[PDB]
């Protein structure tokens, strides 16, 4: 299972890829980027630095979110995407073309990966870079602390979707500047579940599946995990639209869980309990 190999690859690295995370943040800062309208700014960077022309287009083959034309250096980006997802696509291609050697060197540190897993890892690392470019580490970490980890306000502040914020929160393991350690859980209506752990090594799946009963509303609960500790969980369905990295082909629920001992920093931790 290639996806299982890549899950271990990120697990072994605490879900944080330092060289790519730092490369994204340095490129964001050195190019004078500012949060807001990053899709236009990235298009300028792509032209200036690589001679790649970004164009917004419809009728992309297979309703893809992007199509790169390497022979004339044109990146087509789907018109139905919101600015945050347009930026995400462009930054993903920026990693593939401008961080290719770095990505290859990172993948190579896992001696066991199969070929299929190396290809999955390459795309995952380019996606990782895109998240770390749209949400540069120190700025995003500072914003998460000052907004008390409010996923919706973070999304509105940076112009990105709910699962994009959640995934980034689950990567904040930079040494000496960690965020709250989260378990990230994504599931579809049929129970197909992707779980990512930062601190643990393990499950009450209703902590995220419960979101499907109150669509587009945050669902919060406290549940014990297999270690005997209680976790505070926040979950929501993702709208099938132009924002967030999850495909609009079906509906997902996404959630974060943190040790109850970290939950006081969450805006979510005030409220009344019931069965
Ligand atoms: Ca391992
Ligand atoms: Ca969405
Ligand atoms: Cl992709
Ligand atoms: Cl997004
Ligand atoms: Na290194
Ligand atoms: Na870990």
Detailed description of the structure:
The radius of gyration is 18 Å and the shape is globular. Helix 2 packs parallel to helix 6, helix 3 runs parallel beside helix 4 and helix 4 packs across helix 6. The strands form two sheets. The protein has a five-stranded antiparallel β-sheet with strand order 5-4-8-7-6. It has a three-stranded mixed β-sheet with strand order 1-3-2, with helices on one face. With 275 residues, it is α+β, with helices and mostly antiparallel strands. Helix content is 40%, strand content 18%. Bound molecules: calcium ion (CA) (2 copies), chloride ion (2 copies) and sodium ion (NA) (2 copies). One calcium ion binds next to helix 1. The site of one chloride ion (CL) has 9 residues, from helix 4.
């Amino acid at each position: 299972n290639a996806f299982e190999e890549v899950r271990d690859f990120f697990y072994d690295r605490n879900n944080y890829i330092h060289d790519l995370d730092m490369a994204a943040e340095r490129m964001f800062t050195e190019s004078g980027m500012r949060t807001g309208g990053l899709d236009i700014q990235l298009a300028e960077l792509m032209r200036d630095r690589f001679g790649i022309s970004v164009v917004i287009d419809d009728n992309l083959p297979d309703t893809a979110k992007r199509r790169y034309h390497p022979d004339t250096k044109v990146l087509r980006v789907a018109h139905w995407l919101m600015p945050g997802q347009r930026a995400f696509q462009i930054a993903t291609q920026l990693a593939l073309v401008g961080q290719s050697d770095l990505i290859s060197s990172i993948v190579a540190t896992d001696d066991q990966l199969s070929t299929e897993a190396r290809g999955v890892a390459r795309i995952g690392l380019a996606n990782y870079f895109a998240g770390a470019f749209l949400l540069p580490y120190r700025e995003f970490h500072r914003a998460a602390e000052q907004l008390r980890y409010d996923i919706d306000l973070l999304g509105r502040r940076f112009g990105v979707g709910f699962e994009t914020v959640c995934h980034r929160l689950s990567t904040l393991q930079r040494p000496r500047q960690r965020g709250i350690p989260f378990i990230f859980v994504r599931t579809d209506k049929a129970g197909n579940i992707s779980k990512r752990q930062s601190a643990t090594a393990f499950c009450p799946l209703w902590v995220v599946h419960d979101a499907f009963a109150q669509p587009e509303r945050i669902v919060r609960q406290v549940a014990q995990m297999p270690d005997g500790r209680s976790y505070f969980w926040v979950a929501k369905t993702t709208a099938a639209d132009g924002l967030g990295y999850l495909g609009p082909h079906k509906n997902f629920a996404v959630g974060l869980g943190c040790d109850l001992a970290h939950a006081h920093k969450l805006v979510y931790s005030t409220g009344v309990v019931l069965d």
